[PDB]
Nucleic acid binder design. Structure first.
Lengths: 83, 97, 62, 97, 83
DNA sequence: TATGTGACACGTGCCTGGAGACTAGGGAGTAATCCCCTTGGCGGTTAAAACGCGGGGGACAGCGCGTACGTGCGTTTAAGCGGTGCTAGAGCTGTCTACGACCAATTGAGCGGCCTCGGCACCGGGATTCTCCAGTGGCCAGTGGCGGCC
DNA sequence: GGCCGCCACTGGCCACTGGAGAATCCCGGTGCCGAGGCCGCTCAATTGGTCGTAGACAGCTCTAGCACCGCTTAAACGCACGTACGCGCTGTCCCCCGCGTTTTAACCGCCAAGGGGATTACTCCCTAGTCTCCAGGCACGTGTCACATAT
């Protein structure tokens, strides 16, 4: 129930996969933990927004509608989730 | 001798593959577990639609990928082919974060 | 009008990919290769769209 | 002997000066000429409030200056001190222009 | 009556002054005209919208709050002239 | 420091915009419930993650070097002040009508539900395609022998 | 008789070549489940009529922008000239990458629990609106010291 180190759950070969989709030919070894921190900071920003939406909805259930509100609020609008 | 490809050949091949492919590149369960973990930090006992988690995965992967092409632009701009931490830091700061 | 033109683009891409029914990959490839549509929607993200096939010149060998 | 500063010393001195200063670095009347020229290319006989021309000015070098810190960071990122137009192209592409 | 060349009214020393404000100490010679083109691009990007607001106001003379609007459309909000 | 000035800050008419009393009614807060959607749990099943290891390819230090641009200085010009004339035109104010919000009805088009089927996912066998590596000759410089010379 | 220059052999290095091997696609066959099309409901889009009013228009006005003209002076401009800067060469270590091997946990598949999202119902709290009124801040005007410029 209580979990701690799931930032490492985004594994290094997954980061390599993302990089190869990103057109990266070579990846330094120092890249992966930095990108973990970057995706971290991005994700608590967006889910802080999502949590604020959800508590404003008087809900404990997170909806993807709240998620797409949060993503378009940070200027990163996502299509395909009922918006 | 056993077969062995030279470096970059397989890398270019998987670049072509993942540019061709459309699927998510990270595992679903640890991502959902991390999402629940970090959302617990703001408020307790949060329940998640799986669609919301998939939307987070999709937006995160796209954001990271776009940052990676910016990193590629910085690296070729730095006359290098290996990406570097300062490239991502620069790209984040140029984007304004 | 705009749905009609993007549906033209999607149907053309699907026929290029030999598919009867349009998919989000077709949508991605269509929306990124029209400069007015692409710069209309540079910050808009598509579910399961993927990316453009794009490789820098120095990434190629020799 | 006529004194001559070594290169960069003066340039740093007015770097410090213009960072201190807030005044507008553009000759106002040629800028107004360019505004009327470009605006005439879309609609003829356009007349301008001078305050609008002024606001267009500080918006213009706001964009230009921010571009130059972006490109300066790009150039020092590439271990160089003399700026190239490809740095400007990189900055425009990363900003999504 | 018409104008043909005022892009050269943005002189090379003015560009040099701006780069000193940008913290640039050494400037290539290729810089100036390419930057003129870039700033010019920004100029019709703003003045097209400015003209659109001006004609939609049924005015022939451009007013400053229209410029304020057109600048906040580009994510380039300007303070000190709104209203 | 000197100063002189005009921007800035404050006195004053005013009116209009904020506020007080009342009303009506309707949007939101709240109870129930239920059911649907979310949470929790086991067990194969690998794909994927991880680990390791040679080894090439790549960041990167150093240097030379030839340049393009900083710096300096005289010039021209055009930017800038400032002063006048004047007008387009932005903007303020009566008017009355187009036009569109609002109320009763009613339907028919648009949405919930179902079913099926054919587009499409999956798989397996050839054909392809690329690429990387063993030969393959050319080229260039290293090298020993030879002939003339002193 | 030895030396020296020339000449011809030769070995290594470097671009070229064919083939092997593995990745990749393509062709054909097979199942399988979302597309979509048909069917039933319903609610909201439409029709019609009304009231009031938003704004387009008319008309004026006065004001801000445009033009010009002359003076002035600093900015631009252009040339000289040095120097430091990109930047290509070379090399060198070492860093991830390809290629495996292990291992582990992701996922699917299934199954059980329950809980809270959503829905309906009822209620009443609140607030938009209306009439009245008055004072808060804004336009206007006017002294005045902060500081820009000067030294």
């Amino acid at each position: 129930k209580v979990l701690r180190d799931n930032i490492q759950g985004i594994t290094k070969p997954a980061i390599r996969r993302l990089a190869r989709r990103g057109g990266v030919k070579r990846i330094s070894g120092l890249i992966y933990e930095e990108t973990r921190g970057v995706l971290k900071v991005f994700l608590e920003n967006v889910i802080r927004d999502a949590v604020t939406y959800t508590e404003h909805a008087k809900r404990k259930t997170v909806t993807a509608m709240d998620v797409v509100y949060a993503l378009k609020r940070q200027g990163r609008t996502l299509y395909g989730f009922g918006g | 001798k056993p077969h062995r490809y030279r470096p970059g050949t397989v890398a270019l091949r998987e670049i072509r593959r993942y540019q061709k492919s459309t699927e998510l590149l990270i595992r679903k369960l640890p991502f959902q577990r991390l999402v629940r973990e970090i959302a617990q930090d703001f408020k307790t006992d949060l329940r998640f639609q799986s669609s919301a988690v998939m939307a987070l995965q999709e937006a995160s992967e796209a954001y990271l990928v776009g940052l990676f092409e910016d990193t590629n632009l910085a690296a070729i701009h730095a006359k290098r082919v290996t990406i570097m931490p300062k490239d991502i830091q620069l790209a984040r700061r140029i984007r304004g974060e | 009008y705009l749905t009609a033109e993007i549906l033209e683009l999607a149907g053309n891409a699907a026929r290029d990919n030999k598919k009867t029914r349009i998919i989000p990959r077709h949508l991605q490839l269509a929306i990124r290769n029209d400069e007015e549509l692409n710069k209309l929607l540079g910050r808009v993200t598509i579910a399961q769209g993927g990316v453009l096939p794009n490789i820098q010149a120095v990434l190629l060998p020799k």
